[PDB]
């Protein structure tokens, strides 16, 4: 019967920030390799 009013901690949505930054560096990877190919062609 003793249930609590608990806010979400950062651990609950923790991986969403991880796949945010992983999605950021992937776009950093693509923004490099799209300018390099047009500079070759």
């Amino acid at each position: 019967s003793k249930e609590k009013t608990s806010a979400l901690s950062l651990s609950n949505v923790a991986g969403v920030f991880y796949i945010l930054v992983g999605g950021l560096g992937l776009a950093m990877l693509v923004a490099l390799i799209e300018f390099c190919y047009k500079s070759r062609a």
Binding site: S9, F17, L20, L24
Partner: protein
């Protein structure tokens, strides 16, 4: 004993349920304050 001059009974006393004080920052409650910062620092990060 004499005649009953006052009628009474055993009842219950708890502390009164207090005034519902939300605070001036009650809408930020279901998410912890760490997450609201970690949104904003990541909000600037994605826009950068």
């Amino acid at each position: 004993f004499s005649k009953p001059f006052m009628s009474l009974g055993i009842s219950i006393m708890i502390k009164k349920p207090q005034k519902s004080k939300p605070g001036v920052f009650s809408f930020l409650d279901p998410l912890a304050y760490e997450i609201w910062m970690c949104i904003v620092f990541a909000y600037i990060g994605v826009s950068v």
